[PDB]
TrEMBL record, chains A, B:
Transmembrane segments: none annotated. GO terms for biological process: glycerol catabolic process; glycerol-3-phosphate biosynthetic process; triglyceride metabolic process. GO terms for cellular component: mitochondrion. It is an enzyme of class 2 (transferase). Residues 273-464 form the Carbohydrate kinase FGGY C-terminal domain. Belongs to the FGGY kinase family. ADP 3 binds at D22, R24, R26. This is glycerol kinase. The lineage of its organism: Eukaryota, Discoba, Euglenozoa, Kinetoplastea, Metakinetoplastina. The gene is gk.
């Protein structure tokens, strides 16, 4: 008949974007809007929920209008998916339809005290005590402790709970709620596994944990899968219902990192993806039976297509300062001026010439979690230059990623075929080359990199019949979107030495608790 | 009645200078001449003895001619003092009055094998086997080991020793020999305390040591004080005699660090000097009985005025990278552009906010000697900037001196009353401030900065009758050349946290082999 279009709302930490994809999985229109990073106290971070909602409406409004110019024919989007910064938690009132306060963000640290209380009083000192249930350890990261914090610290959230009018939700839940004009109150499986309130295997709330954590189960959305009807766009903000033309269904919702796992087509077990952002997130499909880590890695839902579809599980590892380390060398240290210079400088020298740079600015994590680890450089000499330091920082990222994959490989009980990679630092050739060398697998860099956004459109398109199967979805990707492989070149000696040098380096990073 | 003037030959590693001073201790005329750095093998360094000799003659000539033009009251130089690069060793012939080879320089590593032979066979493994005699460990620096090397590897030397036509001399001896036409074969006690052949307690050659090191006592100069008649300039190379016009006595000889100690007026026990060069050298006057270190510091003669006058001893500490650290951050790391900016950037932050930079690029020295230590930075966060890193560098210079000082304080059973500072990094006002807070004593910075050259002018002039006593020297100086006094200015708790962070940091710097 004619060209069909699916919409993705990509709700991130620093901004909101809306992207329209056509049926050949190509993004044809985009708009982006930043929202304000509220830091009321040191280590705290909150976002304005209404600002996020509007950013989303505006993005939808402009992308549509721009597409209308490119294709005077376009009329309707078949369905819209949402992908979102996870763990961030919105508190709101069922009837005023308004937020009770600003949403604490996933990396916010206000809940540190509640976090000690939980592991001591509830876990007897074991921070992993609920890990066979949720997949997670206790930390400031997860939704639940944000909910507790709002209950304990914000009068409005208190009354509203008493009155039986309190809604909690992650950003997918808030968005779907406000988009539908208060009609939908749902969350998908990937997002709900980041709350600390969901049994990972059954995919249902945990009465046990909501009791002990004292979150009143009536405050929580219905859980669903990543691909099925959530509701429709009813709303009029920024004139969106009118910008869409027919009633538009919402048919995809999925956490950003899992979305990137899905948009990179990591459909079978052992298939993995790393997103280099600020920021590194690595996820591996472990298959249909959930696996639990003996190394501190997270167990989480990878994705579930359909009310009745199979739930695939993931192991997840993170690095905090990846693209942040490059920004730091640039903006904080004046080691170079324009992002271009980073790779050029690191390839200017043959190697790091005895130095290690451990950029644990925010602590360690991964499979060696250490909060007191700090940014460290060792081994310098009067021959050491900034180009060694830059290459060192790039090596450290890849070596942390190596320890993570190495942990995953043992926890899942399987191997890594290859690593799909997206985000900023994957535009860095030297980074990818060192990474392949260490891992010893091929690394695939996608030309169309809007992968996180795509995963959401995939979920919504599959539900809406735009695509019929994972099979079709892959075949379209294979046809439409070229790739670039980076293979290992590491001569097996160089690799193993570099790891033991890095081993030693890690011993010198403990700084201050 | 008429203006009196004293001359100073300052024969350093990279060049030679002749500074004329008036009785106000003002420098009125200078001329500088470089000499070639012959580096025939890696780790090696030697100078052309004769090139050095003509450097000084020509310095004398031109400086004297310049002062006759610009000063009508100038008639003659009352006396000449020599200060020099210590340990650098010349072998020359008693009759030809020429050198048998170039002079290994203090930092030349050719004597390394002979150094391990000595500590293993004479020391029984203990490189300190002679420090209660010489104040020194076995090491590539000292003159004895350069002499042995020359007897072993240079035919003409071995031959000349054979014939009894051999002279050995540090640069002071060589200069005074050649300047006097060969009439004076003398050394000062400061330079002779760097040969490894002088018993510290008598200030005489140790027949025990010359035996064990197989140096014929017949090849060595007579030891004298720093201030007394050495000889007279008689040579006419470059017309010096003609220039000098009258007959001029050489009446000052003193190794370069002891001359900085003397030029900065450290006459009493507890007074110390630090030269902020590449490069840090700290010397403390410890009184009239030699004191020995439990921590690796060198014991030496500080100064002796008069033929058998009172001899003041000293303790010597060094750090390897100071000015070198500042150049490194500019040149290798791009942290700043002009040298101006270093103190500017370091000043724009109130503290280091946790980070420690130990710039042990070439190993650790001083009282925690470790050649495996490498340059290392601990405690960085994403709030850390170049400014904090600059600051931490400067702090680290001060911290290392504090360690050297505390160690000297213990060893000599005494406090530090003031530290007189000089060298390029002494113009860094913030560094000067951190060091005063850290030590808790006043830092004195002289405005007439030619302090190394002046110590030699003062030796010669005390002996010639220009200044009548040590007290007149101090009064003229206080009268004529302004000192800057820099006071302690912090809290004892900030001090103590800074020293605590530091000890910890040191613990993470081992890296090499």
């Amino acid at each position: 008949f004619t060209m069909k279009y699916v919409g993705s709302i990509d709700q991130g930490t620093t901004s909101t974007r809306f992207i329209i994809f056509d049926e050949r999985q190509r993004p044809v229109s985009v708009h982006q809007v930043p929202h304000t990073q509220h830091t009321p106290h040191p280590g705290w971070l909150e976002h304005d929920p209404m600002e996020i909602f509007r950013s989303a409406c505006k993005c939808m409004s402009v992308a549509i209008a721009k597409l209308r110019q490119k294709d005077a024919s376009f009329r309707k989007i078949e369905a819209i998916g949402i992908t979102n910064q996870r763990e961030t938690t919105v508190a709101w009132d069922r009837v005023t339809k308004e937020p009770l306060c600003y949403a604490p963000v996933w990396n916010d640290l206000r809940t540190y005290d509640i976090t000690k209380k939980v592991t001591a009083e509830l876990g007897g000192g074991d921070s992993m005590f609920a890990s066979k249930i949720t997949g997670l350890p206790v930390s400031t990261y997860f939704a639940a402790f944000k909910m507790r914090w709002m209950l304990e610290n914000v009068p409005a959230v208190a009354d509203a709970c008493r009155r039986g009018t309190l809604c909690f939700g992650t950003i997918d839940t808030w968005l779907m709620y406000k988009l539908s004009g208060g009609k939908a109150f749902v969350t998908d499986v990937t997002n709900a596994s980041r709350t600390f309130l969901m049994d990972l295997r059954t995919r249902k709330w945990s009465p046990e944990l909501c009791e002990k954590l004292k979150i009143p189960m009536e405050t929580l959305p219905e859980i669903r899968s990543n691909s099925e009807l959530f509701g429709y766009v009813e709303t009029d903000e920024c004139g969106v219902a009118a910008a869409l033309n027919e009633r538009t269904p919402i048919m995809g919702s999925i956490g950003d990192q899992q979305s990137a796992l899905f948009g990179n087509m990591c459909f079978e077990k052992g298939e993995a993806k790393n997103t280099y952002g600020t920021g590194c997130f690595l996820l591996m499909n472990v298959g249909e039976e959930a696996r639990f880590s003996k190394h501190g890695l997270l167990s989480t839902v990878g994705f579930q297509v359909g009310r009745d579809g199979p739930c695939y599980y993931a192991l997840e590892g993170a690095i905090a300062c990846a693209g942040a380390t490059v920004e730091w060398m640039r903006r904080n240290m004046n080691l170079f001026s324009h992002i271009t210079e980073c790779e050029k400088l690191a390839r200017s020298v043959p190697g790091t010439q005895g130095i290690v740079f451990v950029p644990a600015f925010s602590g360690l994590l991964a499979p060696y979690w250490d909060p007191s680890a700090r940014g460290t450089i060792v081994g310098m000499t009067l021959k050491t230059t900034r180009a060694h330091v830059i290459r060192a920082a790039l090596q450290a990222i890849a070596l942390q990623l190596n320890d993570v994959v190495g942990s995953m490989k043992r926890d899942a009980g399987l191997n890594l075929s290859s690593l799909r990679v997206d985000g900023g630092l994957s535009k860095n050739g030297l980074l990818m080359e060192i990474q392949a060398s260490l891992l010893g697998v091929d690394i695939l860099v996608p030309s169309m990199h809007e992968t996180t956004a795509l995963g959401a459109a995939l979920c919504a398109g599959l539900a809406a019949g735009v695509w019929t199967s994972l099979e079709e979805v892959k075949a379209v990707s294979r046809r439409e979107n070229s790739w670039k492989t980076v293979s290992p070149s590491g001569s097996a000696m160089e690799r193993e030495a570099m790891i033991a040098e890095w081993r030693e380096a890690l011993k010198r990073t403990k700084w201050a608790k």
